[PDB]
């Protein structure tokens, strides 16, 4: 029981895992066992989704979050997102599930049987948190791994069947990406885009060529950065800027994950390219835009001239201008005029929505998709009654978009806290006052009084 | 000690797992009956005859929606005793008429008296100043104003809060729509006391925990405290400097700080009680007359205050027919206030 | 040293009457800009077309408001989430019409209050304190982010962010109940437990310590004179307090460890208010309170109403009246 109590380790049970900070072998165990839980969930959750799955109902009516992820990679789906074959869904779940037993094995072994520390046994695998060179080297290894991970996406997209392309001319379909975007002016341009409306920073990426080119860039950058970090030690300005400790490296990672969680929340909420509405359901903006399109269609069928119909406020009931003049849908959805979607773009001309096209060119499939998206807006209750908050029970629906946004906002938020907690604790422990104020060297007692 | 009284006193004050005292003869049966009345009603008792509502686990409700509901408006402010002229000793009828409501309200009222006596009694025996009892007058003023005064000013107990989670929410929304209770400055002081109290709680606990002295070796610092130790476990000096430089002002006197922690939320709850006494009489803070005159004369004048009254008028029109069934409200569709489309 | 090293020494000085610090260097100007804009707008701004329907709502005192009805009104729904700084407008006249001051206030305020939180970490480091006061502050700060930024983002518009005024805040609450049934949301319920509990334990702690002050003063002088700033001895007797409270309830229902007791005081309202913030931030994406509308059915299929259904009737009143000229189509989807 080598330091598995509070007396020996100085950490209570509820801070139990802090006991692992300088026990590299047991800590590797914690980490491998953990990845096992992650890979486990992925495989079992996939299988559960597949067992519950009725191919003829939209994914988004079935509470699915993982199958949609698989389908977007182009597996199991065809034109319009029609499921042609569930076996890839099956393969993905099984292989994760089996793999998790292997990780679980490794994890349990290192946690409970192998050497508690790895430094005596091996210098390659051993490490000291304060060894700035080892730390950048491990980091460097994982950067190379991550880089290859990005290149696997590219490989799928260009050489192994392509990706689901909601924008595919003629309708959504799987499509091979042959000409990915390589121009750094485009790829790095996205990073300098404003995060506000009508801009959306990286969340705006609206074609697979950009998505593929971006991953080409990232795979290269990450492998390059990995090599760099294996070959180098930190410059002195970096040495002087950071806390160098297990708890501090955790805190930096916590900050970056919180940030990524937040980005992920906005991605799934707004983006319908890498989260195709065919699989994930319509975005909030999209559903709101679909309602105005639905009634524009209905009312014009009834004889309404939609261009000159003045609403109660004096703005056009169906159509109006954005603050920069573009023709856009009216009523509340004015806010959503930045929305772009494949069922809608055919009506858009250079000035925004085109009245000639609206009067003549609205196809039945557009009416159909707008009705569908209007009635699958991402609104529902925690007990999964779909609808507005005043809706009666009947429809069992919460959009996959709401589940993915809400969960990840919560996760990103607590990770930010985790970051503040650990950053502040790491700072204090590095300076030596994390356990409290020395009663005989109280800093404030040595300072001039304020007034 | 001498006579039977003193012997009984001995027994009442024995140092046991649950202190009893004289206050216990009041406290314990009334707290237990109020609570078991609540669990019994929410588990098995309907509200069909009083409200047209299901309200128990037996009928299909869940934890958020069960309640012991108030009696029917036709009951007035009747005590509704089991043996009263309404139920006439019939237990089933009593349950059906709302008897559990007054049962829980009155036993709860006497239980609360008992608890505060228990606070005076324990403090007297331990030899402390009875500030805790005094602080508890705030919960008392709230219970009495809201569960007793309010419905006593209104037409009947029907308009008291019903004992349930969703029932209490309904009570909230009724107060917004009918009384515009958010506008009321006594409710606003209540909010300040409750949110200021919660702020004072968070900020004091966090300040102590972050100016602790190192009195141990453990990275968990809870063990480095001794109940009988002479010294402060944290530095008031550092805490004071920190807040002075952060916020501009700080406590310097620990007795002040703690007294202030009593004062703020207690005074808050007392203020909300006064407003609720006002609402017993429909003496609302509903309107600002100057806004109404300007708005009546100038159809382009709009403020958040006008916007919220349109919400209230929506709430009254839309909830009243099912919320006040004894009024037999029939509001044909054409009379209902509604904006465009919705 | 050099001019820069002197600057750094001053910025980070533990001796300034108000700590400045690196977070302070961002906090001071942003908070000043927000404060100044806020005050001027609250007093003098013209009416703002919040819902982008050319229906300007008067927020300021000079345009017919009092302290209670007054507000700085959210920016136009026609703007949505577009960034609307002063230089994006053709004139200040236009800027004011469209609610530009709101974006300026809330953006500088959010940056400033985030730095206010960083500054709290910073000073505690300079003073040799443990670092978590800033974490307690993350709870109100998260709540402010919920109503001024996250909610607007989810709903596609700053016109749905909380208005910067008293009656405005109530408007936001009421529309929120209609659209999300926030009362039936368990994160909001944890929030209530958090603030009601925070108040309670405040009244409790205040009262337990006060009741236990050691006799140090005359029958005439304030007992506060019994405590001196900086004294080493603890001014009340925690064993007597525990003796009381442990008997009020039962022994183990009471704290004798000041440290764990103060921890509980920090944790209870902070965690509950985190859930409140997260309630608002998750209803931002339309995951709403429990819906038990028509949940109880009789043998024939008659709906038997519950208190959830009476809640529904009140929510419906709010729904159909709110923004009475803004909807043209039957569903309110944001």
């Amino acid at each position: 029981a080598t330091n598995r109590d509070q007396e020996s380790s100085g950490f209570a049970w509820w801070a139990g895992n802090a006991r692992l900070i300088n026990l590299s072998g047991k800590l590797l165990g914690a980490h491998v066992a953990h990845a096992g839980l992650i890979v486990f969930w992925a495989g079992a959750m996939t299988l559960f989704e597949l067992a519950h799955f009725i191919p003829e109902k939209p994914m988004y009516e079935q509470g699915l979050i993982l199958i949609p992820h698989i389908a977007t990679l182009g597996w199991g789906v065809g034109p319009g997102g029609e499921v042609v074959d569930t076996f890839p869904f099956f393969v993905v779940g099984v292989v994760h599930l089996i793999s998790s037993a292997v990780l679980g094995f490794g994890g349990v072994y290192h946690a409970i049987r192998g050497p508690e520390t790895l430094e005596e046994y091996s210098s390659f695998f051993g490490y000291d948190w304060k060894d700035k060179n080892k730390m950048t080297t491990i980091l460097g290894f994982h950067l190379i791994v991550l880089g290859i991970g990005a290149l696997l996406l590219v490989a799928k997209a260009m050489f192994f069947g392509g990706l689901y392309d909601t924008w595919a001319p003629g309708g959504g379909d799987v499509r091979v990406i042959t000409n990915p975007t390589l121009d750094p002016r485009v790829i790095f341009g996205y990073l300098l885009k404003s995060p506000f409306g009508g801009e959306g920073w990286i969340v705006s990426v609206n074609n697979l060529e950009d998505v593929v080119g971006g991953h080409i860039w990232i795979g290269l950058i990450c492998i390059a950065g990995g090599i760099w970090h294996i070959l180098t030690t930190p410059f002195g300005w970096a040495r002087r800027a950071f806390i160098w400790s297990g708890e501090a490296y955790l805190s930096y990672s916590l900050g970056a994950l919180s940030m990524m969680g937040f980005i992920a929340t906005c991605f799934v909420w707004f983006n319908n390219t890498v989260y195709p509405s065919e699989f994930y359901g319509p975005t909030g903006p999209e559903a709101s835009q679909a309602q105005a399109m639905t009634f524009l269609i209905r009312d014009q069928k009834l004889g309404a001239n939609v261009g000159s119909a003045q609403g109660p406020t004096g703005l056009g009931k169906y159509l109006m201008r954005s603050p920069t003049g573009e023709i856009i849908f009216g009523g509340e959805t004015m806010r959503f005029w930045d929305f772009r979607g494949p069922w809608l773009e055919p009506l858009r001309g250079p000035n925004g929505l085109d009245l000639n096209k609206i009067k003549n060119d609205i196809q039945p499939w557009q009416e159909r998709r707008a009705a569908e998206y209007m009635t699958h807006a991402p609104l529902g209750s925690l007990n999964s009654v779909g609808g507005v908050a005043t809706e009666i029970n009947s429809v069992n629906f919460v959009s996959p978009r709401s589940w993915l946004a809400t969960s990840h906002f919560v996760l990103a938020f607590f990770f930010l806290v985790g970051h503040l907690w650990h950053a502040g604790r790491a700072r204090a422990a590095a300076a030596g006052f994390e356990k409290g104020i020395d009663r005989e060297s109280e800093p404030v007692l040595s300072m001039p009084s304020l007034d | 000690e001498r006579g039977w009284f003193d012997i009984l006193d001995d027994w009442l004050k024995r140092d046991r797992f649950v202190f009893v005292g004289w206050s216990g003869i009041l406290l314990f049966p009334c707290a237990y009956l109020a609570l078991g009345g609540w669990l019994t009603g929410t588990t098995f008792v309907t509200s069909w005859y009083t409200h047209g509502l299901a309200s128990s686990y037996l009928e299909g409700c869940n934890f958020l929606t069960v309640a012991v509901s108030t009696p029917a408006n036709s009951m007035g402010h009747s005590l509704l005793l089991l043996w009263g002229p309404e139920a006439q000793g019939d237990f089933t009828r009593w349950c059906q008429l709302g008897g559990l409501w007054t049962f829980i309200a009155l036993h709860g009222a006497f239980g609360l008296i008992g608890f505060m006596l228990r606070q005076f009694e324990i403090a007297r025996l331990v030899g402390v100043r009875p500030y805790n009892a005094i602080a508890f007058s705030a919960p008392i003023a709230v219970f009495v104003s809201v569960f007793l005064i309010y419905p006593l000013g209104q037409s009947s107990w029907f308009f008291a809060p019903s004992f349930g989670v969703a029932a209490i929410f309904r009570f909230l929304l009724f107060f917004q729509g009918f009384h515009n209770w958010t506008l009321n400055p006594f409710h606003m002081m209540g909010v300040a006391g409750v949110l200021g109290g919660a702020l004072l709680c968070a900020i004091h606990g966090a300040t102590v925990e972050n100016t602790l002295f190192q009195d141990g070796e453990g990275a968990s610092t809870f063990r480095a405290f001794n109940p009988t130790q002479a010294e402060e476990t944290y530095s008031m000096v550092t805490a004071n400097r920190f807040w002075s430089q952060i916020f501009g002002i700080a406590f310097s006197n620990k007795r002040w700080l703690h007294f202030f922690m009593l004062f703020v939320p207690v005074t808050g709850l007392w203020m909300s009680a006064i407003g609720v006494v006002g609402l017993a009489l429909n003496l609302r803070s509903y309107d600002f007359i100057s806004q109404e005159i300007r708005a009546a004369e100038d159809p382009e004048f709009e403020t958040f205050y006008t916007k919220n009254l349109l919400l209230n008028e929506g709430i009254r029109a839309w909830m009243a027919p099912q919320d006040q069934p004894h009024e037999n409200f029939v509001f044909p569709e054409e009379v209902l206030p509604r904006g465009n489309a919705l | 040293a050099n001019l820069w090293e002197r600057f750094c020494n001053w910025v980070t000085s533990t001796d300034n009457r108000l700590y400045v610090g690196w977070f302070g260097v961002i906090m001071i100007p942003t908070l000043l800009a927000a404060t100044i804009c806020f005050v001027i707008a609250f007093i003098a701004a013209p009416p703002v077309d919040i819902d982008g329907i050319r229906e300007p709502v008067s927020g300021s005192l000079l345009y017919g408001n009092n302290i209670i009805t007054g507000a700085v009104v959210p920016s136009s729904n026609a703007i949505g989430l577009h960034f609307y700084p002063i230089w994006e407008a053709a004139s200040l006249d236009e800027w004011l019409y469209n609610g530009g001051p709101y974006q300026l206030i809330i953006f500088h305020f959010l940056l400033g209050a985030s730095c206010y939180m960083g500054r709290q970490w910073e000073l505690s480091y300079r003073l040799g304190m443990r670092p978590w006061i800033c974490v307690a502050y993350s709870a109100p700060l998260a709540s402010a982010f919920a109503v001024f930024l996250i909610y607007p983002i989810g709903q596609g518009s700053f016109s749905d962010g909380m208005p910067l005024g008293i009656s405005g805040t109530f408007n936001f609450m009421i529309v929120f109940q209609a659209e999300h049934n926030i009362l039936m949301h368990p994160f909001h319920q944890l929030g209530v437990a958090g603030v009601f509990g925070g108040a309670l334990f405040c009244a409790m702690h205040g009262s337990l310590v006060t009741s236990s002050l050691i006799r140090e003063t005359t029958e005439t002088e304030s007992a506060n004179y019994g405590y001196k700033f900086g004294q080493e001895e603890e001014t009340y007797n925690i064993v007597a307090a525990h003796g009381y409270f442990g008997r009020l309830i039962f022994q183990y229902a009471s704290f004798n460890n000041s440290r764990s007791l103060h921890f509980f005081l920090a944790a209870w309202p902070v965690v509950g208010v985190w859930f409140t913030a997260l309630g608002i931030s998750t209803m931002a994406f339309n995951l709403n309170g429990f819906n038990f509308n028509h949940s109880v059915i009789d043998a024939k299929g008659n709906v038997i109403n519950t208190w959830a259904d009476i809640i529904n009737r009140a929510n419906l009143g709010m729904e159909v009246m709110h923004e009475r000229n803004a909807h043209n189509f039957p569903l309110d989807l944001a």
Binding site: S449 | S244 | R17, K228, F229, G230
Partner: peptide
């Protein structure tokens, strides 16, 4: 008169803030 009164009370509070901070009773460690 009404706006003036509101701004005047407000201004009195802001001034009261400045004195409470900068011209407080100094805390004395004795």
């Amino acid at each position: 008169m009404e706006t003036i009164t509101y701004v005047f009370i407000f201004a009195c509070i802001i001034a009261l803030f400045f004195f409470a901070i900068f011209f407080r009773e100094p805390p004395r460690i004795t």
